[PDB]
Amino acid sequence: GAMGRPALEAVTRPERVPLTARQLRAWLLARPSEETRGRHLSVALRLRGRLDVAALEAALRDVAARHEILRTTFPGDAQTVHQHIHDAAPVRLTPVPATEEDLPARLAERGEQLFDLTRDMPWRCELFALSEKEHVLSVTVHRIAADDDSMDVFFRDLAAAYGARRAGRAPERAPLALQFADYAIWEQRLLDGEREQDSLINDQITFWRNHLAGIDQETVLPFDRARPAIPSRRAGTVALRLDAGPHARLAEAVESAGADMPQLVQAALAMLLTRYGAGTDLVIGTTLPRDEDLIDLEPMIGPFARPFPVRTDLSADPTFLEVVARVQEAVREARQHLDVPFEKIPELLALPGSLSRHPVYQVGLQVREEDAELPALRTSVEPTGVEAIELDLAFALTERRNDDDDEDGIEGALHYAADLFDHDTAASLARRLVRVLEQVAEDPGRRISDLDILLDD
């Protein structure tokens, strides 16, 4: 049998801390053009009340004190990149006068500004002053440093530090058990297993080379323009709803067999793409959060979220239920081989890299379930723009539930690469996915060829 993983634990810091595979890809694909976004996470908070600006400034500084990755730069060339961990991150938070009308423009420009990860800290903040008791705090983090979960951690840790600093003391907290460098060294130790033929990593490399053997470079989709050599990564969105009744009927076929809602929707979407003309050999990817079993990662900031591609075979005009069972079988098997970083897989497949395209999969699906306080302040999320996209299409669906924990509608949005698609093209896709989900909910035995995708005008 295959050997296991090394212990994930605090480690004596080496002189040359490696990047994770996810970071190295982020680093390499940084700024391919100066007209390219901008792979960032941006959050803005509206703050109403008496803001202690010096305290906020000290607090932001304290969050980076707590998390090494926020005071990390990434110097070197492709062969020498390492994580350089500074003692501190410089924060200067002089307020910027602003009006309600000019504010969205200012928020957008600050969040769009490019990082040079060889000499800049991978995050950035600004404070906009609207009136004496009305401010907006804008925070932008580069994806080399944060996944989406990480942004909640950031504001939980901001609030804690603002509390203390506002009251005249430095924060009194226990240090993290793990810093991101400890995770990076762990992943490296795991990948070092290729050395040993019976290692974990070798067993998983074999799985993926086998599972993904012979996939096309691209998914066939209804493009409005040819794929440019250099992506703009601009993105549009279209809303999307599945009503409560159909949502609940779909769930009934959940418990007949073992498949949860994320896999049901993955089935339906795969049938839609075959029906759109993509063929019967498809890869639909999804982004998993950090492994919840790894308890020391919960309180951390880092690029922990992991891409997860599942190949589905749709030949022989399968019933919806047949597609579900193929999805569920594929996912259950792939689920067990997630220690290989996704970003390592293009190599394993000897895939010619491209800037213009996301490797392995170009269509993503996210189906999530439903669901910070600062002293002397009413706080709220100030709406900011849609993030830069690397995928061609990305569905983000949320399951609503009532008070009895029952299915109460699916709500969501389709993000698309504006370089490739017009809004109406994406709107058709979104509406057809809802239609497929309705039909398949009422008639779970329906086959791909019987799917009605006619849209009313």
Binding site: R156, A160, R173, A174, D293
Partner: protein, 373 residues
Amino acid sequence: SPPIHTRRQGFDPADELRAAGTLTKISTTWLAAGHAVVRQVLGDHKRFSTRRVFRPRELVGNLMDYDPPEHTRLRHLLTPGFTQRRMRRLAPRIEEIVTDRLDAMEQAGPPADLIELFADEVPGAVLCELIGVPRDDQAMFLQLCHRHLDASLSARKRAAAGEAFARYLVAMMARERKDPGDGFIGSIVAEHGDTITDEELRGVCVQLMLAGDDNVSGMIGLGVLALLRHPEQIAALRGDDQSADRAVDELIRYLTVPYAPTPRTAVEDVMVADQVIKEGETVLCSLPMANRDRALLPDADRLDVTRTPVPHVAFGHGIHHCLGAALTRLQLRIAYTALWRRFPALQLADPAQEIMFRTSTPAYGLTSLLVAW
């Protein structure tokens, strides 16, 4: 069906519970609902055991699961962390917690949810101070304790959250016995250093978090509601400490938020009037019913916060008598009085809104309560 003894109608025991006599057999499990017989069962530590080579790790440090003499030894070791001297030093910090939570309510502006912002927040924070959790980790730490019990989350996540806040305590234990502080852990190891194992300290701190939160939160919620429904009684809480402490004890008895103490097991045949609790049969005590017994006091079913205190059993009775009773009485006094100091015209934000009772946990409470002022 939910068990008859956990059933309330408003503030009162439910009607089917008010129907069961002093001591009846129910599904062989006995229901003791009389004040006398409940005092007898809790008080007789020789003929009744509380336990279910024996004790699993989750039950370690949970004094409720110990009979004497083990119970005697462990409870004694915890003594230096519960002195009156130590309660009185807690007081300014308890007042500070209560203040910061009242500030939150004011910020959030009228109306505010008393339960979400005040009741569910003060007891947790007071507990963090009792055991000595670092100041600015207390929100984090409480989040984990709460996730650990939040039934809506999968049993997976819940075990995760439980482990993490236990890991925190272990980490915290290392620091404060490597060179002791003078907080909870410190004063206990300074006195009984190589008596109490690290397994016991670890377990005690956990059980403390799970013993003193839900009870106090229910009391804060139901107490504020009970007082607003009888606004003449509020005056008892706008005077001196002696009146506030008297009012608090009446609210504790009238509300009796815990439905039952730990089940008891007859260690032998125990005679009670003309019935016999045979060895091995189990006794469930209804604390609410016992505290409504006419043999305890006249007008038991009326709230009167100016009435002289009575030997109620909301805190239990005997060797397992609530270890956080003094701390509860101090919290509740500080909380109730600071609330009306800050909001003298406190009221239900919406008198027409359905009252939202908490029925799932071991303590009666409210899940929310919108208040204005």
